[PDB]
UniProtKB/Swiss-Prot annotation, chain B:
Modified residues (Phosphothreonine): 243
Gene Ontology terms: cellular component: cytosol; cytosolic proteasome complex; extracellular region; ficolin-1-rich granule lumen; nucleoplasm; nucleus; proteasome accessory complex; proteasome complex
Descriptive protein name: 26S proteasome non-ATPase regulatory subunit 14
Any one Gene Ontology BP term: protein K63-linked deubiquitination
Motif range (JAMM motif): 90-103
Example of a GO MF term: K63-linked deubiquitinase activity
Binding site for Zn(2+): 90, 92, 103
Keyword Hydrolase: yes
Record note on quaternary structure: Component of the 19S proteasome regulatory particle complex. The 26S proteasome consists of a 20S core particle (CP) and two 19S regulatory subunits (RP). The regulatory particle is made of a lid composed of 9 subunits including PSMD4, a base containing 6 ATPases and few additional components. Within the complex, PSMD4 interacts with subunit PSMD7 through their respective MPN domain. Interacts with TXNL1.
Function: Component of the 26S proteasome, a multiprotein complex involved in the ATP-dependent degradation of ubiquitinated proteins. This complex plays a key role in the maintenance of protein homeostasis by removing misfolded or damaged proteins, which could impair cellular functions, and by removing proteins whose functions are no longer required. Therefore, the proteasome participates in numerous cellular processes, including cell cycle progression, apoptosis, or DNA damage repair.
Species this chain originates from: Homo sapiens
Gene3D superfamilies linked: Cytidine Deaminase, domain 2
Group of enzyme by EC: hydrolase
Modification type Phosphoserine: residues: 127, 201
From Swiss-Prot, chain C:
Assembly, per entry: Component of the 19S proteasome regulatory particle complex. The 26S proteasome consists of a 20S core particle (CP) and two 19S regulatory subunits (RP). The regulatory particle is made of a lid composed of 9 subunits, a base containing 6 ATPases including PSMC5 and few additional components. Component of a complex with USP49 and RUVBL1. Interacts with PRPF19. Interacts with TRIM5. Interacts with NDC80. Interacts with PAAF1. Interacts, in vitro, with the thyroid hormone receptor (in a thyroid hormone T3-dependent manner) and with retinoid X receptor (RXR). Interacts with ERCC6.
Residues bearing PTM Phosphoserine: 12
Residues of the full protein shown: 109 to 158 of 406
Function: Component of the 26S proteasome, a multiprotein complex involved in the ATP-dependent degradation of ubiquitinated proteins. This complex plays a key role in the maintenance of protein homeostasis by removing misfolded or damaged proteins, which could impair cellular functions, and by removing proteins whose functions are no longer required. Therefore, the proteasome participates in numerous cellular processes, including cell cycle progression, apoptosis, or DNA damage repair.
Name of the featured protein: 26S proteasome regulatory subunit 8
Membership in a protein family: Belongs to the AAA ATPase family.
Source species: Homo sapiens (Human)
Cellular localisation: Cytoplasm; Nucleus
Curated annotation (Swiss-Prot), chain D:
Subunit structure of this chain's protein: Component of the 19S proteasome regulatory particle complex. The 26S proteasome consists of a 20S core particle (CP) and two 19S regulatory subunits (RP). The regulatory particle is made of a lid composed of 9 subunits including PSMD7, a base containing 6 ATPases and few additional components. Within the complex, PSMD7 interacts with subunit PSMD4 through their respective MPN domain. Interacts with TRIM5.
Residues carrying N6-acetyllysine: 200, 210
Keyword annotations from UniProtKB, A to Z: Acetylation, Isopeptide bond, Proteasome, Ubl conjugation
Annotated protein name in UniProt: 26S proteasome non-ATPase regulatory subunit 7
Pfam families the UniProt entry points to: JAB (PF01398), MitMem_reg (PF13012)
Source species: Homo sapiens
MF annotations from Gene Ontology: protein homodimerization activity
Biological role: Component of the 26S proteasome, a multiprotein complex involved in the ATP-dependent degradation of ubiquitinated proteins. This complex plays a key role in the maintenance of protein homeostasis by removing misfolded or damaged proteins, which could impair cellular functions, and by removing proteins whose functions are no longer required. Therefore, the proteasome participates in numerous cellular processes, including cell cycle progression, apoptosis, or DNA damage repair.
InterPro entries: EIF3F/CSN6-like_C, JAMM/MPN+_dom, MPN, MPN_RPN7_8
Example GO BP: proteasome-mediated ubiquitin-dependent protein catabolic process
Annotated family: Belongs to the peptidase M67A family.
Entry annotated with the keyword Acetylation: yes
From Swiss-Prot, chain E:
Organism: Homo sapiens (Human)
Function in brief: Component of the 26S proteasome, a multiprotein complex involved in the ATP-dependent degradation of ubiquitinated proteins. This complex plays a key role in the maintenance of protein homeostasis by removing misfolded or damaged proteins, which could impair cellular functions, and by removing proteins whose functions are no longer required. Therefore, the proteasome participates in numerous cellular processes, including cell cycle progression, apoptosis, or DNA damage repair.
Protein name: 26S proteasome regulatory subunit 6B
Compartments where found: Cytoplasm; Nucleus
Transmembrane segments: none
Record-stated family: Belongs to the AAA ATPase family.
Subunit structure: Component of the 19S proteasome regulatory particle complex. The 26S proteasome consists of a 20S core particle (CP) and two 19S regulatory subunits (RP). The regulatory particle is made of a lid composed of 9 subunits, a base containing 6 ATPases including PSMC4 and few additional components. Interacts with NR1I3. Interacts with PAAF1. Interacts with TRIM5. Interacts with ZFAND1.
Full-sequence range covered: 71 to 140 of 418
Amino acid sequence: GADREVQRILLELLNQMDGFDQNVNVKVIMATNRADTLDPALLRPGRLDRKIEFPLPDRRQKRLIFSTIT
Amino acid sequence: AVDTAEQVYISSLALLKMLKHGRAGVPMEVMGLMLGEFVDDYTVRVIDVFAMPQSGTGVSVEAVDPVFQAKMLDMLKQTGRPEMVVGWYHSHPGFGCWLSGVDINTQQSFEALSERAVAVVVDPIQSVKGKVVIDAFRLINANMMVLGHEPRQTTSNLGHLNKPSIQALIHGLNRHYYSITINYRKNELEQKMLLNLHKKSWMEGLTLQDYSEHCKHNESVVKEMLELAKNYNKAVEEEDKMTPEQLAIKNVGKQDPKRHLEEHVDVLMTSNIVQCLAAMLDTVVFK
Amino acid sequence: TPNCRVALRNDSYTLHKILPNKVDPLVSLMMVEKVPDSTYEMIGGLDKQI
Amino acid sequence: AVQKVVVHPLVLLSVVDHFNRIGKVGNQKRVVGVLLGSWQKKVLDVSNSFAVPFDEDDKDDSVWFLDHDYLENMYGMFKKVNARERIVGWYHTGPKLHKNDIAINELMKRYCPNSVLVIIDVKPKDLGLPTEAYISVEEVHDDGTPTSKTFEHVTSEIGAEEAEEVGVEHLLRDIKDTTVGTLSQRITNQVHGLKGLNSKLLDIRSYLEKVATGKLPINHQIIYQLQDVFNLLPDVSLQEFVKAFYLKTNDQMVVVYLASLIRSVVALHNLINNKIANRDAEKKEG
Amino acid sequence: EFLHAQEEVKRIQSIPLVIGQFLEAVDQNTAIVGSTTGSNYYVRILSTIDRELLKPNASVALHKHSNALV
């Protein structure tokens, strides 16, 4: 059903990010849990390149997180 | 079978009844009959019009109740002034200057009853600020088309400002016979009464209003003209040496010299001096 | 001129003016691309292949 | 009981036409009917009118007749076509009011509890007044004065009916009674505003003079209660202008710097542009 | 008379407008706007408002029954 509409919305967002073309110094970042389902149009280099994974609390870091929060 | 460049002397109160009835029954396409009399063939005059509630059936001849119409006519004869029924009016929000199929049918019944029974289209929704549409036409029999068509008679009057709508052209109405010219009974003792009394502002010109909202208004005025400062700045460095009109056409900015003209500055200047003169006039009155 | 834009009328929809292209700007980028430069001078190390 | 009434620009002309059409055979000068409308928030409005032939005799002002069955049938038809419309009062022409008004009000108040009277000046257009409103109050003239009729005037203002702006603009289309031509129009606004102020205040001065002569009964018990404060209100003290020497004169002097100068500069820019164009055209024509 | 006439013609309804997002200013006195329900139709652009706030793909305001750029 409305999935085609979502695809068209992403297509326009791809159009806008291509229209950006480094004209100014603004930045765009998406946060996702799994990038497997994401469309290749954004996933391909030339539109967005830097892929960063933020893992689980990393027990040594987890104790650091608790100390910071506490 | 004679329909010259006919004109309707519609009355102002008939207009007011039309707009009030249309404003009341907006989406219902309320119906009514235009109370006019054929003093002669083409100088039809309408002095009064009434409002009737459309029945739940819709656009039907029985919706205009005959007994109710007769009682209303008797009431007008006893109190007021009697007037014949040779026309009808209808708020038409659906589309423009033409008649729907049912409207054509009920107008045909009216034409059978009356002599002409003009078909008047008044659009209550399109009339918003300046243009109210009152177009009147006649239904014709099949004989008028097979003879010399365009029943518009030999004169150069109904061709003045005769622009039937495109939906009216493709309907038979406003195309069967002609479009009737409209006139307004702007007689004196009536029109002078309206202009003198209704649009009443007679001692309201003494308002002072020095700084009721004007101190911050002047702040906005300075800010807006500061934008004009940047705009009139931007212009003086554009100012190219290649016939600046050539530069201006392809680089329109609607700046102070071009669109935000001196007239706006005059409006600001007039506003200031008016408050000045009013304050100063009452200051010398304060004795 | 086919594959262009035009202006119509309200009811009869009669032509008013042949507008410039509107389909192309809107859906120019769906899954394709027009000609880039990327000249062969930038391509290097694969001379024996080109 | 109503706080105030507001008359629409919707019924004034209808009443005048009704006066004209029924005055062809009835030259009594007295046209009596009912004004219909609505009263919602202590603001009474009139939306419809109707006239009935009406004859009078000067003998105690008790000779008259109406068509009440036809008038009642009109009200039922008007309510059937528009439920919100109701008889808000009854109107009579002839601003020189006679004594039958109390009998008419008593008879018609079965349609409206707060019966009101309305006078429409069909021929008179004195300054700008189309009509006047009247409220019936007979609950003792004053604290220490004898009984009287005392029909007072509830304040009336001409309202702004909707959808009639299109018609009135098309109707007149000649005077353009709007702020158009801001400078000149406001000058005309100042002109008849002074004309109205001078005429009305002269009327007040004449009333004070005639009260002094005593040829007419004196309604001082409300005249001085309303005019004493008017006279003693301190709008003549000029020391607040001293405290506000720059009341706006600062805005006056910036407008001189920033409206007259700006107009001079832009006009100067146009002329020197034209002079350059004319000089170039003259030199390069041949 | 003509200053009065010039101040006469500038009524333009002066009434509550509506929004259909502008697409792009093709030329002067001609334009293409997109109403929110779609119904993308060519309109006429008045000289009152122009490039100073006529950015290509920003939401604009249009007359209620006219849908004209204001």
